[PDB]
Amino acid sequence: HHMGLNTAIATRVNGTPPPEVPIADIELGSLDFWALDDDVRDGAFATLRREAPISFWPTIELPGFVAGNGHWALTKYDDVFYASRHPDIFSSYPNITINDQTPELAEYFGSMIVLDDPRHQRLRSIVSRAFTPKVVARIEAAVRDRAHRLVSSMIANNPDRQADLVSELAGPLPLQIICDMMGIPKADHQRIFHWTNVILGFGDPDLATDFDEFMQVSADIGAYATALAEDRRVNHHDDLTSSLVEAEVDGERLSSREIASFFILLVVAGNETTRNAITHGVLALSRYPEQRDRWWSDFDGLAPTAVEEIVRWASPVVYMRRTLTQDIELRGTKMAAGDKVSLWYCSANRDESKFADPWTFDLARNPNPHLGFGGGGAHFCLGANLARREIRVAFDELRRQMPDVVATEEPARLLSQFIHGIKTLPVTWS
Numbered sequence: 001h002h003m004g005l006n007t008a009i010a011t012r013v014n015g016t017p018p019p020e021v022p023i024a025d026i027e028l029g030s031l032d033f034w035a036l037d038d039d040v041r042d043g044a045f046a047t048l049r050r051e052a053p054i055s056f057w058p059t060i061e062l063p064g065f066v067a068g069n070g071h072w073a074l075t076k077y078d079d080v081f082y083a084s085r086h087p088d089i090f091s092s093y094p095n096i097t098i099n100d101q102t103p104e105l106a107e108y109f110g111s112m113i114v115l116d117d118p119r120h121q122r123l124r125s126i127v128s129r130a131f132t133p134k135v136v137a138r139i140e141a142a143v144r145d146r147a148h149r150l151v152s153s154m155i156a157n158n159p160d161r162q163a164d165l166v167s168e169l170a171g172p173l174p175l176q177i178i179c180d181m182m183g184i185p186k187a188d189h190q191r192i193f194h195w196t197n198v199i200l201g202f203g204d205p206d207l208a209t210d211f212d213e214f215m216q217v218s219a220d221i222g223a224y225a226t227a228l229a230e231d232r233r234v235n236h237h238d239d240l241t242s243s244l245v246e247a248e249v250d251g252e253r254l255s256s257r258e259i260a261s262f263f264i265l266l267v268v269a270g271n272e273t274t275r276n277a278i279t280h281g282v283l284a285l286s287r288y289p290e291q292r293d294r295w296w297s298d299f300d301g302l303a304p305t306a307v308e309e310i311v312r313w314a315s316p317v318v319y320m321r322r323t324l325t326q327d328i329e330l331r332g333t334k335m336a337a338g339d340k341v342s343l344w345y346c347s348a349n350r351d352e353s354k355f356a357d358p359w360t361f362d363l364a365r366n367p368n369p370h371l372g373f374g375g376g377g378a379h380f381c382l383g384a385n386l387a388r389r390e391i392r393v394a395f396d397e398l399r400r401q402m403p404d405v406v407a408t409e410e411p412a413r414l415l416s417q418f419i420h421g422i423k424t425l426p427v428t429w430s
């Protein structure tokens, strides 16, 4: 007989640690592990932090991908932070997922995220101004207009007061914003959404499991990027695609592959993780109603810490991979030049060596040095200011229009080692 709406999901006792998981039951290199309940996953990373803070795992092989060599998993905050801040040792080349890069993949996935400096920073500087706090602040009106309309439409479209948060708010809000920043016409936003979803959801049968489909999607978005870039070359617009085609690095314009890769990076990065932060945030407010109440009764005062706690809690990017350029030793584990190293942000963000009470979802948490946007340094998330603003506005519009919005079913969770995703989240309101 809990308070609230009759079909709301069960609440949880805030602060309860999950049971730790016997190490023999942990297989980071099997998709089956990524299908387990998030409580079991959290307890497994707790076991690793305790018993095997640096451990070795085989690489998963999604259909058509090349697994290649295995990887050393860094599950402690300090090691993820150290690796992030030493890119001369922990290189982002040749890939930031664990699979091997191939020439075929590099045509579409060869952006600055898989490069070291100086070339990485010369590419990043083409677009960095558009993502700075003061420039992102100027698009508050666009974020608010879109979020307000989406929440209003949830109400207008659903006489029964039941909706899917993902398709009706969390997905379409960041999609609109990044597509408008890129200069993509509204008629194509839903094609961009589907392409994003396949690129980042590959291996989940609800998204795609045929490598031919992954490659067709990659080629189609790459061709879309090229064609839009060609238009902007001839007639400039005040959009990021125009910035990309007009730029020079080391005195040369970007090639077609560089344009395609940069466009794909920005549009794919620019929507799915923010979508998932919003959905995980609504799930957390549903499980921890006292946190909802405290945010709703001081929205602007708590918003800066609340948004960061949602990102720490959700850790929308589970890991990033690096490749060693020289031998090292961490925690008595020798690792060799050329070895793959995986940085588990999801685990760093529960590390009791860094966080007081890591199992408490605390929207006032301060300080909150989470690694949800990475450990800092050269590749720190370009979109962090944009994501923070989108998350804040989405929750402010829910608070104002449907303050008792609550999840009514447990999420359908994306099957992924890389992205902590929710495919559907049914919600209701009064």
Ligand code: HEM
Pocket: 084, 112, 113, 114, 124, 178, 265, 266, 267, 269, 270, 271, 273, 274, 277, 311, 315, 316, 317, 320, 345, 371, 372, 373, 374, 375, 376, 377, 378, 379, 380, 381, 382, 383, 384, 386, 387
């Ligand atoms: C809550 C949402 C988001 C999370 C949790 C997130 C997380 C991350 C993480 C962990 C990295 C890697 C950092 C590193 O290697 O040190 C990253 C990089 C990146 N993110 Fe995000 N991101 C989010 C939203 C966005 C948005 C909205 C964009 C907009 C386009 C974006 C664009 C990028 C780009 C371009 C990079 C590569 C930066 C570089 O290589 O210099 N992200 N993000």
Ligand SMILES: CCOC(=O)CCCCCCn1ccnc1
Pocket: 097, 109, 199, 200, 264, 265, 268, 269, 270, 273, 317, 381, 383
């Ligand atoms: C993996 C296949 O897609 C790519 O290579 C391009 C997008 C990479 C996104 C990396 C994850 N992310 C999302 C938001 N900030 C970071």
Ligand SMILES: [Cl-]
Pocket: 283, 284, 287
């Ligand atoms: Cl939760």
Ligand SMILES: [Mg+2]
Pocket: 162, 163, 164
């Ligand atoms: Mg419906």
Ligand SMILES: [Mg+2]
Pocket: 180, 183, 184, 185
């Ligand atoms: Mg436009």
